[PDB]
């Protein structure tokens, strides 16, 4: 390693030490509220006076902020300098700052958060040390003026290099450049970890999910031609969806549904992955809105399957889970609406599941077939199994009526199935 | 069989014939020992420059290779040779016709396992002796005790204990006393690989059906299990750079990396070595480095490095994928035609049935490059059957001509 | 006598003490805001330095851990997380087109003769 490179690491280790007046001017001039000329003239007491008041306003809106008055916004924090602390003390200091940035993530639209975070910028130099956490918590605010001020005073980490053109520029970053940042595989792992912390803390909010969903969905689209890169995208984003489904929040579950559906069409998957997907979808369905979004997702995924077993019956455990979260009446309503999406493959597989495991529900099979038109080969599969039902199960009015339904519609095909089977 | 004009010197174009390579360190220099037929070669890991080649060819092919500082142990037929800088110092001859299979050296003990499930133990004559020479005892594993011997391993901080690993299960022998101290519970799947972990008392076992088992010997029970369905493990190795990483090589030619801390796959290197030639025969992290050396039966040796994370925080999460660092290779099949490239005798051209033309260095650098078949405008070509080269106009225009099998024209190459 | 409570408050201000703050930072919890074998030969064997083998074992084991620090992956030893498991099983997620009777939409497998 050259001497310059070894000196580059030294320069980064003590970037915030303020060895001379010129260094102090740069560190102190950074601000989120004021311009550089005014900021250099300010002292910590004036900055802390505004931040402490701003924290009180945030405490009223969210009581959780009041805890930071004890540690990060204390009067003794004015005298606390990170450069004279040890390893252990800094880790504790870093943990408190990261926690604050999570709380402040959803309140950046409020003016007080900008004053409260000024103290952390001026006192603790978060824009130099906690630079990734700050950028991550404010990605969805990329169009707001506050995000623009952040880019000016901050040194972009290696993974945020796409944003360099918008540092100290008139125009804000475009949505197209957001996709390029998320397109990077390394950045996806970084954002996955940050999103994971939010889910554990229940710190997620709708604007974060909306922005996160769009970036993930657009990232699939840009890679539609590249099948290999879609394959590498699987461990990351489908793992994210599993975590979002695990969350109790309905908004989190809906985002997982949206991520799953756009992927399923973009890349065809093994039926095992699709079946595993629905078991995760169905495990944590309590919200009504999530329940609506789930059914459309489940119908869509089965539509993507195009190999043998496309319309085979669901597994026993899988079928029992589905009917519990979706009654037969609920499915009948789903088929009832004229604007119903294409779900023939699922209904065909659902119909065959009923014949295998539920005998009382055969009468519902007759209603389901009338509501939805199934494809020619799907109709053949249902007839083929119902023939086995007659041989094994006792003859029933609903069973013969199901046959009579097939007698009325496309009589000739009924003979062929009987001819091949008996 | 001996000439009065000629004597063999070394082999050019072989890095490894498929026998697992052995690694070691001399002070600050890491070295890699690779078997090439009836002789072995020692490379410098930092540069992949050839350091030593065995002085003579063994009467038979080498089955095992173990490297311990300045001494390289090579097993062939019923004999184990002890070599220093490629020069044979001491030859150990076993008393049974059974051929040696595996080899383990720890402290003053040398352990050799034969194909007949017999383990021969040798000891140093003197505690300051450089290599073991004396015959200590013989330990034989019977079918009731265990299956065929898979590999001989030694765990750290085990006094005179040899961890014999068989297809059926693991066995622990005290070589000093020659007694079966511990017998492991039977495993459902056939064990194929064994690797001592950098932790105390755990040994990683690889099975025939893509299962990796971090078995704890002291507690005698399973600790963790990684599933790799529809795969066969061929090599295992732990990272000693301070990251709890495990690299799993497969006979399909893939190399997977697991983060034991987070229970997740870091990355997979697909098709680094040919499946037809045994996939990844050997893969080892260098002790204390992010560099992993990989070998296969396709006559190729590669090194990959794990770069530092690009994230200032949570670097453990954001792991850079392994980056190809350097490699040495050659033909995958015997060369069909050869020619000396220059009057100085620095390079040779070579063509093989694998439809590739290669240039091999005749110096210690051991450099090797395949000439590009990318065509000028204005799958590999069929095997070369005749070749002619000149150097009167090298650097001016084409200076090589080749003939291809069942082809009605000849191609030209520029050296 | 030990000084009074309102005395420390004065001393904290006058001397600019920050110990109380550092304790809160340490207490800051993010959640709140949001053998099968015995070898006889081991015991009766002793080595020069005499020390019995059993104590010699611990000396080596302590030495081993200094070279290699102990990691934490050894300390640990309709289902919600079914989807996480199926991703671990395979690193091939594209369905094999051999089974499919419908040719892929955008990629054509075509070879010249």
């Amino acid at each position: 390693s050259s001497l310059s490179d070894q000196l580059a690491q030294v320069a980064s280790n003590n970037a915030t030490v303020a060895l001379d007046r010129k260094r102090r001017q740069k560190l102190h001039s950074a601000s989120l509220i004021y311009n550089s000329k005014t900021a250099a003239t300010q002292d910590y007491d004036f900055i802390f006076e505004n931040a402490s008041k701003a924290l009180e306003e945030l405490s009223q809106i969210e009581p959780k902020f009041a805890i930071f008055s004890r540690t990060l916004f204390s009067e003794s924090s004015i005298s606390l300098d990170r450069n004279v602390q040890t390893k252990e003390e800094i880790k504790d200091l870093d943990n408190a700052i990261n926690a604050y940035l999570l709380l402040a993530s959803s309140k950046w639209y409020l003016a007080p958060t900008l004053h409260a975070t000024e103290w952390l910028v001026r006192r603790f130099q978060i824009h130099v040390k906690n630079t990734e956490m700050l950028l991550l918590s404010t990605l969805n605010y990329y169009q707001t003026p506050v995000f623009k001020r952040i880019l000016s005073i901050i040194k972009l980490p290696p993974l945020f290099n796409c944003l360099s053109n918008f540092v100290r520029s008139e125009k804000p970053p475009t949505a197209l450049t957001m996709i390029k940042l998320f397109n990077d595989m390394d950045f996806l792992k970084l954002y996955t970890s940050y999103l994971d912390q939010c889910i554990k803390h229940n710190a997620t909010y709708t604007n974060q999910l909306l922005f996160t969903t769009c970036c993930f969905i657009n990232v699939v689209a840009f890679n539609s031609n590249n099948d290999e890169k879609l394959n590498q995208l699987v461990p990351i984003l489908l793992e994210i969806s599993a975590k979002l489904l695990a969350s109790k929040s309905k908004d989190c579950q809906i985002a997982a549904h949206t991520i799953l559906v756009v992927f399923a069409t973009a890349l065809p998957l093994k039926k095992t992955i699709i079946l595993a997907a629905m078991e995760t979808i169905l495990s944590n369905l309590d919200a009504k809105e999530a329940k609506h979004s789930a059914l459309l997702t489940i119908c869509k995924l089965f539509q993507t399957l195009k190999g043998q077993g496309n319309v085979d019956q669901l597994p026993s455990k899988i079928f029992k889970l589905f009917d519990s979260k979706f009654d037969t009446v609920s499915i009948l309503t789903f088929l009832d609406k004229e604007d119903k999406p294409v779900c023939d493959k699922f209904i065909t597989s659902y119909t065959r599941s009923i014949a295998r495991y539920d005998r009382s529900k055969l009468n519902i099979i007759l209603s389901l077939l009338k509501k939805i038109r199934l494809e020619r080969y799907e109709v053949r599969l249902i007839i083929t199994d119902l023939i086995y039902l007659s041989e094994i199960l006792e003859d029933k009015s609903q069973l013969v009526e199901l046959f009579e339904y097939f007698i009325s519609i496309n009589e000739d095909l009924v003979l062929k199935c009987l001819k091949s089977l008996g | 069989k001996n000439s009065k004009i000629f004597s063999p010197f070394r082999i050019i174009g072989n890095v490894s014939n498929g026998v697992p390579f052995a690694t070691g360190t001399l002070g600050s220099t890491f070295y890699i020992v690779t078997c090439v037929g009836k002789t072995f070669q020692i490379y410098d890991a930092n540069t992949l420059h050839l350091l030593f080649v065995s002085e003579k060819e063994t009467p038979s092919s080498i089955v095992a290779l173990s490297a311990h500082f300045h001494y390289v142990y090579a097993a062939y037929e019923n004999k184990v040779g002890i070599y220093k800088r490629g020069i044979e110092e001491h030859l150990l001859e076993l008393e049974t016709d059974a051929n040696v299979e595996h080899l383990c050296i720890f402290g003053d003990y040398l352990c050799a396992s034969t194909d007949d499930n017999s383990i021969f133990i040798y000891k140093k004559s003197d505690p300051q002796d450089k290599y073991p020479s004396e015959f200590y005892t013989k330990l034989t594993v019977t079918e009731i005790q265990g299956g065929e011997i898979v590999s001989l391993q030694h765990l750290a901080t085990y006094l005179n204990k040899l961890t014999v690993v068989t297809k059926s299960n693991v066995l622990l022998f005290n070589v000093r006393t020659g007694k079966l101290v511990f017998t492991s519970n039977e495993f459902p799947d056939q064990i194929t690989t064994a690797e001592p972990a950098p932790v105390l008392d755990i040994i990683a076992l690889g099975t025939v059906t893509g299962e990796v088992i971090m078995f704890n010997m002291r507690k005698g029970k399973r600790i963790r299990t990684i599933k790799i369905p529809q795969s066969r493990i061929s090599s295992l190795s732990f990272r000693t750079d301070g990251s709890s990483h495990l690299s799993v090589g497969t006979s399909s030619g893939d190399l997977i990396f697991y983060d034991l801390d987070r229970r997740s796959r870091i990355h997979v290197l697909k098709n680094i070595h040919r499946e037809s030639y045994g996939g990844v025969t050997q893969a080892t992290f260098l002790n204390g480095q992010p560099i992993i050396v990989t070998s296969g039966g396709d006559n190729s040796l590669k090194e990959y490095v794990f770069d530092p994370s690009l994230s200032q925080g949570s670097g453990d999460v954001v792991v850079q994928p392994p980056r190809y660092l350097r490699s040495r290779g050659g033909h995958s099949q015997p060369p069909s035609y050869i020619a000396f490239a220059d009057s100085q005798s620095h390079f040779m051209l070579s063509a093989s049935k694998d439809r590739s033309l290669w240039s091999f260095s005749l110096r210690k650098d051991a450099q090797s490059q395949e000439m590009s078949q990318r065509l000028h405008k204005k799958s590999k070509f069929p095997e070369i059957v005749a070749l002619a080269i000149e150097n009167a106009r090298i650097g001016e225009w084409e200076n090589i001509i080749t003939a291809h099998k069942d082809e009605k024209f000849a191609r030209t190459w520029d050296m | 006598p030990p000084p009074d409570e309102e005395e420390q408050l004065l001393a904290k201000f006058v001397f600019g003490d920050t110990t109380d703050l550092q304790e809160n930072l340490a207490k800051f919890n993010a959640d709140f805001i949001f053998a099968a074998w015995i070898d006889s030969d081991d015991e009766k064997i002793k080595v020069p330095i005499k020390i019995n083998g059993v104590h010699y074992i611990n000396r080596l084991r302590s030495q081993f851990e200094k070279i290699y620090p102990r990691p934490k992956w050894v300390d640990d030893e309709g289902d919600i997380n079914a989807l996480t498991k199926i991703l671990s099983t395979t690193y091939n997620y594209k369905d094999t087109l051999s089974n499919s009777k419908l040719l892929p939409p955008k990629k054509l497998d075509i070879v010249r003769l």
């Binding site: 796409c162 | 402290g107 003053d108 204390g288 | -």
Partner: peptide, 24 residues
Amino acid sequence: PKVVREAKKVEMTEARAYNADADT
């Protein structure tokens, strides 16, 4: 601009290794 990934030159470093002589 893209994320710069410089293939930095990596050279090996000596490390401490457990000695198996003590095991005997």
